[PDB]
């Protein structure tokens, strides 16, 4: 407990003392052009381009989204988007490398420009640890 570092009673840390939920919301859109060329929200693979990520896309239902139950981690693709140009370059979103948790709420929506708006929220319970500040 020397030099401004304090000792915290594990036992009560377990009984839930100072535990806290942590939320996050990665969000994306489906860009277009006055020149009818739109993007996509799917579960892309192969298909002439390669432009893809390292992680997994399997926790992606066919709507290009995860379900709120899914336990995502490492880098697991949270969203699936594509760009047809001249035939599939990826624009899918990956859970930040340091993070992980569980999906907590997905939602689809319109944009003023009638585009597909989708935000995703992930939850995590954060436990006090031998280093956290108080």
């Amino acid at each position: 407990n020397q030099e401004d570092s304090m000792i915290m009673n594990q036992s009560s840390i377990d009984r839930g003392l100072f535990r806290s939920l942590f939320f996050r919301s990665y969000m994306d859109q489906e860009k277009k052009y006055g020149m009818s060329i739109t993007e996509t929200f799917e579960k892309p693979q192969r298909t002439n381009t390669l432009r893809m990520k390292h992680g997994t896309y399997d926790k992606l239902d066919d709507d290009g989204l995860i379900a709120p139950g899914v336990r995502v981690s490492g880098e697991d693709v949270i969203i699936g988007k594509t760009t047809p140009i001249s035939s599939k370059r990826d624009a899918s979103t990956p859970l930040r490398s340091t993070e992980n948790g569980i999906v907590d709420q997905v939602l689809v929506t319109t944009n003023q420009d009638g585009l597909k708006f989708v935000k995703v929220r992930v939850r995590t319970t954060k436990i006090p640890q031998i280093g956290d500040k108080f």
Partner: protein, 1417 residues
């Protein structure tokens, strides 16, 4: 590095040559004709038009293509192209010189404007300095504007001789935007000098003339300062950033190249078609601009030149500007691989030098260990283990420069290594690594630690290694770096290991002690009252790892067998550790248990705390390091720790409000010490609101009021606390935590249990922000303390709104500078660094730089490494002549003054020997030479100084190594002793040279030591004081010698950076405030700038030899110096109309006329009414006053005056076409250009009684205070030759002056003294050598070269070097301009190059001796 072997020989840059591109060369080099301004699109088709970027230059898209010189992107440095400009342009940054050149050369012809013929020119022409030549030259030729064809030869100005011709008048040129124009001359004739015109003239300029000006015919000819063909830089320079594929993305420069390109095209297409000759120039100025832009886009003639959007457009030179910009941003410091950083929290179970690393991290950072038949077995295991098991690895690299990824490769667990392959393994326990915490202002802000992989996400460092980095655990983070070569590691462990760092060279004392818990508790455990029983005395011995496995005999056996901390704590102290102390009432049976005495490595007596185990001088640590070594001492921490921390774990310790409450009656006794103190204020306020007090000379009646109120409340507050201090028993926890020395002090207790104190800003108690009041809750003009900010309450009690507020306003000031001095201090630091970098001891013992220029002939004036030095006391110097003799005097020809034969073994057979009494004279006669020589170096008498080889201890070691009795006699010939100490002096070699000048330096830079040496090795002491046997002596001697030789500085020692920091560090720890003469932070600043007008100039002058404590003699000089003007004694002046020069229209004047006609003029009068009280202060006389006046004007102004007796002092006068105008101009000339007494610039002059130690006739030094006059302004040359002063001691803090009057030397002396007094005015201690080195560097080049862009960064140092601080780019420009050559001898150069710099470790070569590589087998 690079990838793919290159047959071409490998070399390192040993020299850099600067110059300017000759158009013909750029053409030569170019691989692209570059005509088109677009990028590629073969009409939308992606490729790269043969027009811009890659019309053969480098390339994009991962395509080997690049003129078949393949290599694809990585391996292919860029490839330059060019572009033929339509018309000559000015190189944006040279436009200055291009102009100063013309100012020096004639047009229509093109030759110099001053030949050897002109004398002042010869001189300039001989100035050897490519820069100061072209400097002095222009200072001449910028005047003459007649290309003279004939001038008088070196004979008679009668005849004239001819040289070059065509005297066409040369125009006066001026700068207007990007064009040079001038006038030729009634009334001028203006024309705009074209570029084409200028260039032509330059081309013609003669070759020996290029050279006359700052040029070089080979590398940079004056003309090339104008560009013809523009060098176009390639892709890696201005990369493109595409947004996937079907989207643009082009760099900034890849535009102003095209903007230029386009401004070129149109130009030409106007010069080959209907060219409206005066509408082209309107289009030429554009190209001149875009090319100014491209390179520089931050100029005078505003026109920022923004890119479509407002974006400024980074000019090439913008990419370089120091900090962030290439030089200071990418070269002097870059982000590196193999590094990590997280949150620190100390761990009390980690050897001093360890550093717990989170498994996670170790599993991330690797280390390339080549396969070798010693570690193959272990490596093949670590490899199988994979990158996910901790003691594992993550990459294997075969000879075939290719890498296997241990986490994918289908042959992951397969792989059987091959000697010679390298494997990247996870960092493991005991891997040396660089741990640091920035701000990094110490040699110790970075130290190598033993790695200890541990769980949990945090770097776990030892407590005692806390203060070096200066960290705490409130969230602080730490950076870690991982060595990579086998030597890199070694270099990290042999010089940066934490143990080596324990003794800090900046303050020749350790720099890591025992903090908090361990300290606090070690104190308790020591008290006589602290006892421990077997059960625990055992679990305590167990925790000491080195424990011999032997329980020491109980300090008590009688009823219960107990032990005392002092005992067990001692089991941690190694054998041979001898420590002696003595505090206040301390004597070999310390009553209050003070002092400290440890013999044989066992605590004998005294309590242990900050003083005995802190980062202090006598420090048991400081001693264990010196006596046992880095290692032994480094372990010592952990032990003293482990025992104590454990003990405390069980004895417990705390603090609570209860520790801050004062006795029932004491809290009262104080209250009324504030009440009474309140009235001693109300009292002097009454006595002020009555004018019943006199003005203490030099202070305002008001100021003097404060000066007391302040000194009243302060003394009140001072005891207010002191009542409680002694009111807190030896059980008060807070007290305990203060004695241990582990936290807080008196002040603290005070503000918490007694009185908080007086609040303040800008030095004065809470102002009157509200007209005449503190808060609106106050009555106007309330000068009391309850209004001006005096918090009478204690924290335990609680502030009242008012008190609470003021308090805030007070703290607010505090927080301010802790948030200002924070980075300005860092600048001042940075400067010192970039100012001594290249200073390092050399193999001959010279302290020089990247020029060999000798800054110091023997580092520190002795060639000693501060680490090996301690505060010794030169005996000889102090004490009475009487007591001196009775100590070192030996007289074999005397019954009473001879060595009793109970000391020596030949005491009786020696008594009377004439031949011996002579060697005994040589000796005693010596010691006296010393005594008088030391009072010649240290006129203070202070006999304590830092000196290598601690002789006091070295002898104490003999003391018990041979066990000597204070009874039975020694066995040394008198020759044994005396002769033996002479033979020693002979081997204490610092410099080694064969010749004399060197051999002299030897004796020189040694002396001081030798005296200390004699002082403790005089026959008398050596036998009567420390009965040394013959044996002992031969040992002490041999050791002094050995020790010394280790205490010498090592050639390599990067001395400059050291002293640089050593100085700036103890500055980051000061306040920007100059409160509580301009000193501290701002002062140092003031100095390093070599300021021409310091805030406080002031100057101290001492009386003359005799008259010392002559009170009235003081005044008698004051008023002969302190500048007094008529203006300061005149209450009013009026100009009446009195036409009768024999009577007045004024009453109180009559007498004054008649009484002034016994033992022509103007009818206009001028009367002055001087002040009475003002004539007694600066002391003056009507006789004098007027006398002066009269002789000021003289025969054209008759003046009169009354006599000192009257009740109204006056001075009438008249002159001798409008007089009311004249007699008014003479009104001023009287009040502001006329002095009475004093030397100008010298206002206020106070007197003071100072402490001056001095030689009593009877020998001993004693208190003899003497008056001294301090000024408030500065003139020397004059206030020096005044009768009554000692022009051998006078002193102004204005070093600038001192140097001008007493010779640079004396100047240096001041510069140092002033810097020293700035560090020392803060309690902090730094070792001479540091300040000196700085002082010396500023001084050596001849004068006072400031530590600023206008100083060191302006010498003959390398170009790349100075370029890495402040003027970054121009420094290069005027470097390629005059074609400078850089040694690459500067630390910087090499860092910038990526080569090992000549720094300690690299200040030499390592070669295999084939000869000896054969005899070994």
């Amino acid at each position: 590095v690079g990838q793919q072997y290159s047959s071409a020989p490998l070399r390192t840059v040993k020299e850099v040559q600067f110059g300017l591109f000759s158009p013909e060369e750029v053409r030569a080099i170019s691989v692209a004709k570059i005509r088109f301004p677009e990028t590629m699109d073969e009409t939308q088709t992606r490729a790269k038009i043969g027009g811009l970027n890659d019309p053969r230059l480098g390339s994009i898209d991962r395509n080997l293509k690049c003129q078949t010189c393949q290599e694809g992107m990585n391996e292919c440095p860029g490839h330059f192209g060019h572009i033929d400009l339509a018309k000559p342009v000015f190189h944006v940054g040279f436009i200055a010189k291009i102009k100063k050149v013309c100012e020096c050369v004639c047009m229509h012809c093109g030759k110099l404007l001053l030949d050897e013929h002109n004398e002042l020119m010869r001189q300039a022409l001989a100035i050897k300095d490519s820069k100061k030549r072209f400097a002095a030259i222009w200072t001449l030729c910028k005047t003459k504007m007649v290309c003279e064809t004939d001038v008088p030869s070196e004979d008679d100005p009668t005849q004239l001789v001819s040289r070059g011709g065509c005297g066409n008048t040369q125009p006066t040129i001026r700068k207007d935007g990007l064009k040079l124009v001038g006038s030729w001359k009634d009334e001028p004739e203006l024309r705009v000098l074209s570029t084409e015109e200028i260039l032509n003239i330059f081309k013609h300029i003669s070759v020996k003339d290029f050279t006359s000006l700052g040029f070089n015919e080979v590398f940079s000819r004056p003309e090339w300062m104008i560009l013809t063909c523009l060098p176009v830089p390639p892709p890696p320079v201005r990369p493109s950033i595409s947004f996937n594929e079907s989207q643009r993305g082009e760099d900034d420069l890849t535009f102003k190249l095209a903007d230029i390109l386009k401004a070129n095209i149109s130009l030409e297409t106007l010069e080959h078609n209907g060219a409206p000759h005066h509408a082209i120039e309107e289009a030429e100025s554009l190209l001149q601009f875009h090319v100014a832009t491209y390179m520089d886009n931050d100029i005078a003639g505003q026109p920022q030149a923004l890119q479509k959007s407002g974006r400024p457009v980074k000019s090439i030179r913008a990419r370089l500007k120091g900090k962030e910009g290439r030089i200071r941003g990418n070269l002097m410091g870059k982000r590196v691989d193999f590094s990590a950083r997280t949150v620190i929290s100390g761990d009390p179970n980690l050897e001093l030098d360890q550093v717990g690393v989170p498994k996670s991290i170790a599993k991330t950072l690797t280390y390339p260990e080549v396969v070798t038949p010693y570690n193959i077995d272990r490596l093949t295991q670590l490899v199988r283990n994979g990158p996910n098991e901790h003691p594992g690895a993550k990459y294997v690299i075969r000879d075939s420069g290719d890498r296997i990824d241990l986490r994918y490769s289908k042959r992951a667990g397969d792989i059987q290594l091959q000697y010679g392959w390298k494997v990247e393994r996870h960092i493991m326990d005991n891997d040396p690594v660089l741990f640091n915490r920035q701000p990094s202002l110490h040699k110790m802000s970075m130290m190598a630690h033993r790695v200890k992989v541990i769980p949990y996400s945090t770097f776990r460092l030892n407590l005692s290694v806390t203060s070096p980095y200066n960290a705490d655990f409130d969230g602080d983070e730490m950076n870690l770096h991982v060595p990579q070569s086998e030597e890199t590691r070694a270099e990290l462990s042999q010089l940066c290991a934490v143990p080596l760092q324990i003794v800090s060279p900046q303050s020749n004392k350790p720099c890591m002690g025992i903090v908090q818990d361990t300290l606090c508790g070690i104190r308790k455990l020591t008290l006589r009252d602290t006892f421990i029983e077997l059960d625990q005395v055992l679990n305590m011995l167990y925790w000491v790892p080195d424990w011999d496995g032997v329980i020491p005999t109980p300090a008590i056996i009688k009823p219960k067998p107990l032990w005392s901390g002092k005992q067990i704590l001692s089991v941690a102290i190694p054998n041979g550790i001898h420590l002696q102390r003595f505090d206040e009432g301390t004597t070999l049976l310390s009553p209050k248990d003070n002092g400290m005495l440890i013999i044989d490595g066992q605590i004998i007596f005294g309590v242990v705390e900050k003083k005995t185990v802190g980062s202090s001088n006598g420090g048991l640590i400081h001693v264990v390091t010196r006596e046992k070594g880095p290692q032994v001492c480094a372990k010592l921490f952990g032990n003293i720790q482990k025992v104590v921390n454990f003990w405390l774990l069980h004895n417990g310790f705390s603090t609570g409000i209860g520790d801050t409450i004062a006795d029932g009656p004491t809290m009262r006794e104080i209250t009324e010490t504030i009440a009474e103190a309140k009235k001693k204020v109300l009292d002097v306020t009454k006595e002020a609101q009555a004018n019943l007090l006199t003005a203490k000379h030099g202070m305002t009646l008001r100021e003097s009021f404060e000066d007391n109120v302040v000194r009243f409340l302060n003394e009140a507050r001072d005891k207010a606390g002191r009542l409680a201090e002694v009111n807190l028993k030896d059980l008060n926890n807070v007290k305990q935590m203060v004695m241990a020395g582990s936290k807080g002090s008196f002040i603290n207790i005070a503000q918490m249990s007694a009185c908080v104190g007086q609040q303040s800003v800008e030095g004065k108690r809470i102002a009157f922000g509200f007209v005449d009041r503190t808060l609106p809750h106050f009555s106007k003009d309330d000068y009391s303390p309850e209004s001006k900010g005096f918090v009478e309450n204690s924290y335990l009690r609680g502030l009242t709104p008012q008190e609470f507020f003021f308090h805030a306003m007070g703290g607010r000031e505090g927080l301010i500078d802790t948030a200002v001095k924070t980075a300005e201090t860092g600048y001042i630091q940075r400067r010192l660094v970039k100012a001594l970098e290249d200073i390092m001891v050399h193999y001959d013992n010279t302290t020089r730089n990247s020029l060999g220029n000798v800054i110091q002939f023997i580092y520190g004036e002795d060639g000693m490494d501060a680490a090996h030095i301690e505060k010794q006391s030169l005996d000889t110097i102090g004490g009475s002549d009487a007591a001196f003799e009775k100590r070192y005097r030996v007289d074999l020809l005397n019954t009473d003054h001879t060595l009793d034969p109970s000391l020596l073994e030949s005491g009786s057979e020696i008594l009377g020997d004439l031949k011996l009494q002579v060697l005994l004279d040589e000796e005693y006669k010596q010691l006296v030479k010393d005594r008088k020589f030391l009072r010649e170096v240290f006129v203070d008498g202070e006999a304590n100084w830092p000196l290598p080889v601690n002789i006091r201890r070295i002898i104490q070691n003999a003391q018990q190594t041979f066990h000597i009795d204070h009874t039975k006699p020694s066995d040394l010939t008198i020759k044994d002793i005396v002769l033996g100490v002479k033979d020693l002096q002979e081997n204490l070699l610092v410099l080694r040279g064969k010749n004399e000048i060197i051999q002299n330096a030897q004796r020189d830079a040694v002396t001081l030591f030798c005296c200390l040496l004699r002082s403790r090795l005089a026959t008398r002491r050596v036998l009567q004081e420390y009965r040394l046997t013959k044996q002992a002596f031969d040992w002490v001697l041999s050791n002094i010698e050995a020790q010394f030789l280790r205490s010498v500085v090592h050639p390599g020692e990067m001395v400059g950076v050291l002293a640089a920091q050593s100085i700036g560090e103890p500055a980051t720890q000061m306040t920007l405030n100059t409160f509580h003469v301009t000193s501290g932070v701002p002062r140092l600043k003031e100095i390093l700038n070599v300021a021409k007008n310091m805030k406080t100039p002031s100057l101290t002058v001492y009386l003359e030899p005799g008259h010392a404590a002559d009170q009235e003699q003081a005044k008698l000089i004051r008023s002969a110096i302190e500048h007094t003007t008529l203006k300061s004694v005149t209450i009013a002046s009026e100009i009446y109309y009195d036409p009768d020069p024999r009577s007045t229209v004024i009453p109180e004047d009559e007498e004054i006329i008649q009484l002034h006609f016994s033992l022509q003029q103007s009818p206009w009068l001028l009367r002055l009414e001087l002040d009475r009280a003002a004539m007694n202060d600066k002391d003056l006389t009507m006789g004098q006053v007027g006398e002066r006046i009269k002789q000021t004007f003289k025969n054209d102004l008759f003046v009169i005056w009354s006599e000192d007796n009257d009740e109204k002092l006056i001075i009438r006068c008249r002159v001798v076409a409008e007089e009311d105008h004249m007699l008014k101009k003479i009104e001023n000339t009287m009040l502001e250009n006329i002095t009475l007494r004093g030397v100008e610039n010298i206002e206020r002059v106070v007197m003071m009684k100072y402490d001056r130690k001095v030689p009593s006739p009877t020998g001993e030094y004693v208190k003899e205070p003497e008056w001294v006059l301090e000024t408030d302004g500065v003139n020397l040359s004059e206030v020096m030759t005044v009768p009554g002063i000692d022009p051998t001691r006078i002193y102004t803090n204005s070093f600038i002056d001192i140097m001008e009057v007493l010779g640079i030397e004396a100047g240096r002396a001041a510069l140092y003294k002033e810097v020293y007094n700035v560090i020392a005015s803060d309690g902090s201690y730094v070792n001479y050598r540091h300040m000196a080195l700085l002082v010396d560097v500023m001084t050596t080049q001849g004068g006072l070269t400031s530590v600023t862009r206008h100083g060191f960064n302006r010498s003959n140092t390398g170009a790349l070097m100075r370029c890495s601080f402040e003027e970054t780019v121009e420094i290069l420009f005027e470097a390629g301009a005059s074609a400078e050559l850089d040694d690459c001898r500067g630390v910087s150069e090499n860092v910038i190059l990526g080569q090992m710099a000549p720094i300690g470790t690299g200040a030499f070569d390592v070669m295999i001796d084939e000869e000896s590589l054969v005899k070994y087998m």
